[PDB]
Each structure stands twice: as C-alpha cells, then as structure tokens.
Ligand binder design. Structure first.
Ligand SMILES: C1CCN(C[C@H]2COC3(CCCCC3)O2)CC1
Ligand SMILES: [Cl-]
Ligand SMILES: [Cl-]
Ligand SMILES: [Cl-]
Ligand SMILES: [Cl-]
Ligand SMILES: [Cl-]
Ligand SMILES: [Cl-]
Ligand SMILES: [Cl-]
Ligand SMILES: [Mg+2]
Length: 345
C-alpha cells in the first residue's frame, strides 16, 4: 500500500498517493477533477474524486457501473483507466473513490471552431472514431453521448473517445448541443434503440467537420425533428410499423410527407466519397444504418484502413445491470474492483 498525503484544495480534502504531485483544480456534479503529475509514469493526469458515490442505491450502482466500464476499455482510440484508489484501509472505512486517466487538452470543438481542416484531416479523424466504436460495439456497449466535446484530439490529430453515457430532462431542453447529435428514435423514445444510435452521432459530427456548421441545431425536440426530416425524408410505412408509441406514430402521420434531399446539393463541394458515406450513416430507420465495422471498409478511408489493425474487445459481462442489490452490496462489489485493479504496462 502506498503512502498517502492529505490537502485541502478549493474547499475539498484530497488524500492521494505520494506518486501524484502538484495537484491543480481544473473542474467540478459527478465529482471534482485536479490535474497532476504522475511521478511513476511521467504523464500529466486527471484525478477525479467522486462526489457522494454511495449516497443511494442508484448512485452506488452508477459508481460500480462506471468503474467496471473504465477497467474494461483497452484501446488506442478509447479513454482507459491508469489507476483507481481509495485511502480506506478496510471495507468498514471505505467511502471515497478516485479515478486517474491521461490528461486531455483540446477537444474536437477547439479543432472545428478555429482550424482549417482538409479532407485528409476529416478522413483521419472519422476513421479513428469508427475504429474505437468497432471496439466498443464488439463488447455490446453503446456510448449514447457521442459529440465533439466528448472527443479528445492532440497536435498530431490523434483522437480518443471519452465520457461514456452512464442525462436529465432539463439538460436536453431547448437550444443545446447536448441534443443536436442524438438519433431521432432515442431523442423522442420511439423504440428500443440499438448501437447504431452512435453511428447517427458520427454522421452529425462528420457533417460538421466538413462544413464548419452544426447539422441539426434545433431550438427544441420538435424543431430538431423537422430539420432531420427535411434532410432524410419522412418515414415510410415500414419504419412507422416499428415505432411503439401510438401517440408518436400519430404525431408523425400529421406531418406533410417529404422526400429525401440530394446530399450533393447540401454538402456542396465535398469529396463524393464523403457524401456517399454520410448517406449511409444518416438513415432514419436504424435497422438500415451502416455499422462501424462496415464503415471502416468504405472507400473513403482507403488511405488508413488496415483490417489486421482494427481490434475487437474481450467479452464484457453486464449481467449486474439486471441485479437488485442493497447499497452496502454495491459498495462491497466496488471495493473488490478497486483492490483488484492491475495497472497497464
Ligand atoms: C451544410 C451546413 C450545415 N447545414 C445546416 C442545416 C440546418 O438546417 C438544414 C438541415 C439539413 C437540411 C437543410 C436545412 O441545414 C446545411 C449545409
Ligand atoms: Cl488512455
Ligand atoms: Cl475512504
Ligand atoms: Cl459538443
Ligand atoms: Cl489523444
Ligand atoms: Cl419505447
Ligand atoms: Cl435536394
Ligand atoms: Cl466481463
Ligand atoms: Mg463530456
């Protein structure tokens, strides 16, 4: 067991192993984050102290869920776990959880907002998102919250996916980027959704990289749906059959019918191969959207595609999600996962 030291930073007590030095507050409802230098590995890191991890059954289960998922992710284009620790010496005194990851600088917002992106840059950035998603989806995990602020990028244009969906009603209301990248079937709860909700998000992000503008910046759920249907057309009977809410089907049928637009007249001047790929991602019927593995083999990525270097994940057991436990049982499971952690090479 390492030696810990305590300190108060911005009205919060931080007790961490000596290896972590020069802690500097950088952000704060799921927890507080400090930047630090990890003397063991030489990396600058983010250290997150979880806020009230075991205050309710819901919170204790969410803590366990986040820890299991971060321990599993081992891929160049996905954020991984460098360390996890508690200053507790026993389950009896266990109350605080700290998570350690690589410190991320820019996100994709800083890139698209204030940079000139060639088509070659768009190819490489979207390639890396799809490479990470093929890995994530192979474990039957759905990200659910892909958007530019959840994509870290460095000076060499290398990309990592972070901030897995693990949101409230108010946070999705109005003119907010938190909803602009969501597939319509989950935005309006049309049906039980698949992993291709993430592919819809990738299409929205690719369109924005190519044009410098948000694809579907709706002022509310209904305004955003209208923008979406103007581009991809209104649903045919085949998809309407798959929508569960009779009220939702009723609402859809009240709209005048519209054909799919010509994407070459929307994304003027774009690489024709990029246009072709967007038409395969931005399909209203989620059964018919291209998958991550299929998209990697698309001719738009011929420069980067290497089928011997696009790995899949080890199997991921999520049976706990249907389990009904007490706070102290979720807490004990989390404790076991903290003490069994093995750091990467
Ligand atoms: C590339 C730059 C981003 N979009 C902007 C969006 C906003 O409303 C719509 C949605 C798509 C169907 C047309 C209307 O365009 C235009 C071209
Ligand atoms: Cl990482
Ligand atoms: Cl503790
Ligand atoms: Cl964003
Ligand atoms: Cl990175
Ligand atoms: Cl439903
Ligand atoms: Cl058109
Ligand atoms: Cl597992
Ligand atoms: Mg985020």
């Amino acid at each position: 067991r390492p030696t810990f030291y305590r300190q108060e930073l911005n009205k919060t007590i931080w007790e961490v192993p000596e290896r972590y030095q020069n802690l500097s507050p950088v952000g704060s409802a799921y927890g507080s984050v400090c930047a630090a230098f990890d003397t063991k590995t030489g990396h600058r890191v983010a250290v997150k102290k979880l806020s009230r991890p075991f205050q309710s059954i819901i919170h204790a289960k969410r803590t366990y869920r986040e820890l299991r998922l971060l321990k599993h992710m081992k891929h160049e284009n996905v954020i991984g776990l460098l360390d996890v620790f508690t200053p507790a010496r026993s389950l009896e005194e266990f109350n605080d959880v700290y998570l350690v990851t690589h410190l991320m600088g820019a996100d994709l917002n800083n890139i698209v907002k204030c940079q000139k992106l060639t088509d070659d840059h768009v190819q490489f950035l979207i390639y890396q998102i799809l490479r990470g998603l093929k890995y994530i989806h192979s474990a039957d995990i759905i990200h659910r919250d892909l958007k530019p602020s959840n994509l870290a990028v460095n000076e060499d244009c290398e990309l990592k996916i972070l901030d897995f969906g693990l949101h409230t009603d108010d946070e999705m209301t109005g003119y907010v980027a938190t909803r602009w990248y969501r597939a319509p079937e989950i935005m309006l709860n049309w049906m039980h959704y698949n992993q291709t909700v993430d592919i819809w998000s990738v299409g929205c992000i690719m369109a924005e990289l190519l044009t410098g503008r948000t694809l579907f910046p709706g002022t509310d759920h209904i305004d955003q749906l209208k923008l979406i249907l103007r581009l991809v057309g209104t649903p045919g009977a085949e998809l309407l059959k798959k929508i569960s809410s009779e009220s939702a089907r009723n609402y859809i049928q009240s709209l005048a019918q519209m054909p799919k637009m010509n994407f070459a007249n929307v994304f003027i001047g774009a690489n024709p191969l990029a246009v072709d790929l967007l038409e395969k991602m931005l399909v209203l019927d989620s059964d018919k959207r291209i998958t991550a593995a299929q998209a990697l083999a698309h001719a738009y990525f011929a420069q980067y595609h290497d089928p011997d270097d696009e790995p899949v994940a080890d199997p991921y057991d999520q049976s706990f999600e249907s389990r009904d436990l007490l706070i102290d049982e979720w807490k004990s499971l989390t404790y076991d996962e903290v003490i069994s952690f093995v750091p990467p090479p």
